[PDB]
């Protein structure tokens, strides 16, 4: 089955996470959520590997990302501190 959850208790590697996330509700995509587009080589999140491209994000540091737009999640991740507490899910579609 798809759809295994993880809490990602991630610390940055000198100011980098390493995630390119996209999506939202109001834009082109019907699906209504924030998704991983790509994983930035030599990132924190990148090398961790609980996060990987094509996953679905649930929450950022408490904040439920469902209903948030493309900008919001990006700005949210940008405005993260040292230790970053994510929640995400291992795939919708295989």
From Swiss-Prot:
Q: Where does it live in the cell? A: Cytoplasm, Cytoskeleton; Nucleus; Cell projection, Lamellipodium
Where expressed (tissue)? Expressed predominantly in kidney and, to a lesser extent, in lung, heart, brain and testis.
Its domain of life reads Eukaryota
Q: Which cysteines form disulfides?
A: none
Boundaries of each PDZ domain copy? 7-92
Query: Which family, according to UniProt?
Result: Belongs to the protein-tyrosine phosphatase family. Non-receptor class subfamily.
Subunit details: Interacts (via the first PDZ domain) with PLEKHA1 and PLEKHA2. Interacts (via the second PDZ domain) with TNFRSF6 (Fas receptor) (via C-terminus). Interacts (via the second PDZ domain) with TRIP6 (via the third LIM domain and C-terminus). Interacts (via the third PDZ domain) with NGFR (via C-terminal SVP motif) and PKN2 (via C-terminus). Interacts (via the second or fourth PDZ domains) with PDLIM4 (via C-terminus only or via combined C-terminus and LIM domain, but not LIM domain only). Found in a complex with PDLIM4 and TRIP6.
Record function comment: Tyrosine phosphatase which negatively regulates FAS-induced apoptosis and NGFR-mediated pro-apoptotic signaling. May regulate phosphoinositide 3-kinase (PI3K) signaling through dephosphorylation of PIK3R2.
Query: What is this protein identified as?
Result: Tyrosine-protein phosphatase non-receptor type 13
Recorded source organism is: Mus musculus
Lineage, highest ranks first: Eukaryota, Metazoa, Chordata, Craniata, Vertebrata
State the gene name recorded for this protein. Answer: Ptpn13
């Amino acid at each position: 089955k798809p759809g295994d959850t993880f809490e990602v208790e991630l610390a940055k590697t000198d100011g980098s996470l390493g995630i390119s996330v996209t999506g939202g509700v109001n834009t082109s995509v019907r699906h209504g959520g924030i998704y991983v587009k790509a994983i930035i080589p030599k990132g924190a999140a990148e090398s961790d590997g609980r996060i990987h491209k094509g996953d679905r994000v649930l929450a950022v540091n408490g904040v439920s990302l469902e209903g948030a737009t493309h900008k919001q999640a990006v700005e949210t991740l940008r405005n993260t501190g040292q230790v970053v507490h994510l929640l995400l899910e291992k795939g919708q579609v295989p």
